[PDB]
Design a protein around this ligand. Structure first.
Ligand SMILES: COC(=O)CNC(=O)c1ccccc1Cl
Ligand SMILES: COC(=O)CNC(=O)c1ccccc1Cl
Ligand SMILES: COC(=O)CNC(=O)c1ccccc1Cl
Lengths: 300, 237
């Protein structure tokens, strides 16, 4: 069980760690988060009390280094940093644990939610979507745009998700216009799965990462990417059976976790009605359709 | 974006453009089967592709053989239309290719956009005008060449005859749309108007009668009467 130390908490802030959220008061004696489960990526995110503008946060994996948070009064945010001196770090954490200054990752033992939301998410792939190679962790915020968004403006600060565009030469084989537009199997299976992602695990990992950035930061381009990747599968007549069964599980836990009061902005009525009721896979997502109908029957 | 009353003079500027109407591509007669079920029989159709500035009608005749063994024909018809329009553009010299293609029905937008991905600079646009191009099969010489076709064939008509020698393309288009609206609202009456007088003939190389300027004003007034009449007869006014 690993730990992320905070030097201090000089400004009042809501801190979230995965699907959990807690409030820290200005100059409260808070020195971080302990008992973080090893084996998963994690995200530690922030919303300042005085300016709800800009949710921001850091994706990280404690197996890849010792990380801590320190407020920067010049740039005005909580920054993640790596501590290379391992004995200094252990000693700082031990002292803060002894003084009971750290909150505890509150994982209920029955609870597989975070595993189920990050099953295919790997740090190495996050770091290729979010390019800042001098750090082992990845910053994301509410305002960051995606590569595809910038095509339609600072590239260093972009989310380099895989571009998906249903009316593009990549998506449409010359001479198979109608076939490929009405049945996206070619684009899913040959172009994206065989060509770009290599396997369905990497595809699902980007899908899950995009959802989590949408949910935790309100990142609009991430929400677009999540829906596009769902729609590409649902609009394909030919999808491996294991991929469909896994997709249903993935979406089920995403819909289960979504705050009820954010459904209006984070769910696209067109995509979901098409996917659940008109698409080739309208009958392949039983778990997702049942939770959608009991939780968001208005959207449908 | 969408083509409407606000930007109507754009049709007659010097940027090459084409209207595409697909309303006569897939045509059927519905009939009873010996067992008392209903079935369709397709008949030959056509794509109506028109330069409104010059009057050039590129009429691709759609032979019934193109539907043999195919499913979802109303959907296929839109993609067939888009394939044939894309093939026409590719067959034209660069300097003759349109800068815009305006579709008369919005369901042609995605099929045409996908077929024209190779032409990113050609804009595919809808229109809010309710154009009467479906009535093109009420023009006798166009209907004749469609129904006689034994194979796919492109007929090359100027739908204004020689009118542009005497009038502008705005006026020629207005005359065409009035004639076609009339033929659409009451074909029998419209054709009676156009042919009542046996001394006014249709040249072998024309579609419409050789009316003097004065006779066209008479004709045009008779077509507006017909349209208003039918609008009364229809709504009781
Ligand atoms: C109690 O004062 C100190 O502990 C000095 N070191 C830090 O504050 C620090 C805090 C958290 C994590 C890393 C450092 Cl590098
Ligand atoms: C809030 O109810 C929960 O079940 C999850 N626990 C927290 O949110 C929490 C509360 C205080 C400090 C840290 C956390 Cl992570
Ligand atoms: C038969 O070859 C031709 O070049 C016909 N001449 C035209 O001006 C024309 C061309 C295309 C369509 C309609 C016309 Cl009316």
């Amino acid at each position: 069980m690993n730990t992320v130390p905070f030097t201090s908490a000089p400004i009042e802030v809501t801190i979230g760690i995965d699907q959990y959220s807690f409030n820290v008061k200005e100059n409260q004696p808070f020195h971080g988060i302990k008992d973080i489960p090893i084996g998963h990526v994690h995200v530690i995110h922030f919303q300042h009390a005085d300016n709800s503008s800009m949710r921001y946060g850091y994706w990280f994996d404690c197996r890849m280094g010792n990380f801590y948070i320190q407020y920067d009064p010049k740039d005005g945010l909580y920054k993640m940093m790596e501590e290379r001196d391992g004995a200094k770090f252990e000693n700082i954490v031990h002292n803060f644990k002894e003084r009971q200054m750290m909150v505890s990752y509150p994982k209920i033992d029955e609870d597989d939610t975070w595993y189920n939301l990050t099953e295919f998410v790997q740090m190495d792939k996050i770091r290729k979507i979010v390019r800042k190679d001098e750090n082992q962790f990845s910053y994301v915020d509410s305002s960051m745009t995606t590569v595809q968004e910038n095509e339609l403006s600072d590239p260093a600060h972009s989310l380099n998700y895989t571009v998906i565009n249903f009316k593009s030469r990549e998506a449409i084989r010359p001479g198979h216009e109608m076939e490929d537009f009405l049945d996206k199997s070619y684009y899913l299976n040959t172009v994206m799965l065989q060509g770009i992602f290599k396997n369905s695990s990497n595809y699902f990992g980007e899908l899950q990462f995009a959802f989590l950035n949408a949910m935790f930061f309100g990142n609009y381009g991430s929400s677009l990417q999540w829906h596009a990747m769902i729609e590409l599968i649902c609009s394909s007549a030919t999808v491996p059976k294991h991929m469909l069964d896994k997709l249903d599980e993935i979406l089920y836990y995403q819909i289960k976790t979504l705050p009820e009061q954010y459904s209006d902005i984070l769910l696209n009525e067109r995509v979901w009605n098409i996917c659940l009721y008109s698409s080739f896979q309208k009958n392949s997502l039983h778990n997702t359709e049942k939770i959608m109908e009991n939780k968001y029957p208005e959207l449908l | 974006g969408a083509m409407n009353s606000s930007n109507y003079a754009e049709l007659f500027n010097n940027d090459i453009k084409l209207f595409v109407d697909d309303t006569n591509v897939y045509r059927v007669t519905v009939h009873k089967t010996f067992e008392g079920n209903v079935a369709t029989k397709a008949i030959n159709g056509c794509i109506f592709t028109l330069n409104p500035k010059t009057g050039h009608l590129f009429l691709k005749i759609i032979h019934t053989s193109v539907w043999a063994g195919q499913k979802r024909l109303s959907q296929l018809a839109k993609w067939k239309t888009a394939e044939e329009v894309s093939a026409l553009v590719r067959s034209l010299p660069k300097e003759e290719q349109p800068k815009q293609i305006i579709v008369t029905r919005k369901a042609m937008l995605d099929p045409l956009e996908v077929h024209m991905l190779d032409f990113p600079n050609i804009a595919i646009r809808p229109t809010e005008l309710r154009l009467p191009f479906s009535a093109a099969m009420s023009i006798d010489k166009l209907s004749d060449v469609v129904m006689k076709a034994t194979e796919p064939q492109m007929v090359l008509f100027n739908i204004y005859d020689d009118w542009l020698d005497r009038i502008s393309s705005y006026t020629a288009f207005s005359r065409l749309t009035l004639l076609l609206r009339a033929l659409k609202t009451n074909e029998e009456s419209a054709k009676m108007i156009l042919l009542s007088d046996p001394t006014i003939t249709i040249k072998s190389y024309h579609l419409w009668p050789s009316f003097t300027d004065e006779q066209w004003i008479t004709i045009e007034s008779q077509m507006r009467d017909l349209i208003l009449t039918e609008y009364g007869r229809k709504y009781n006014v």
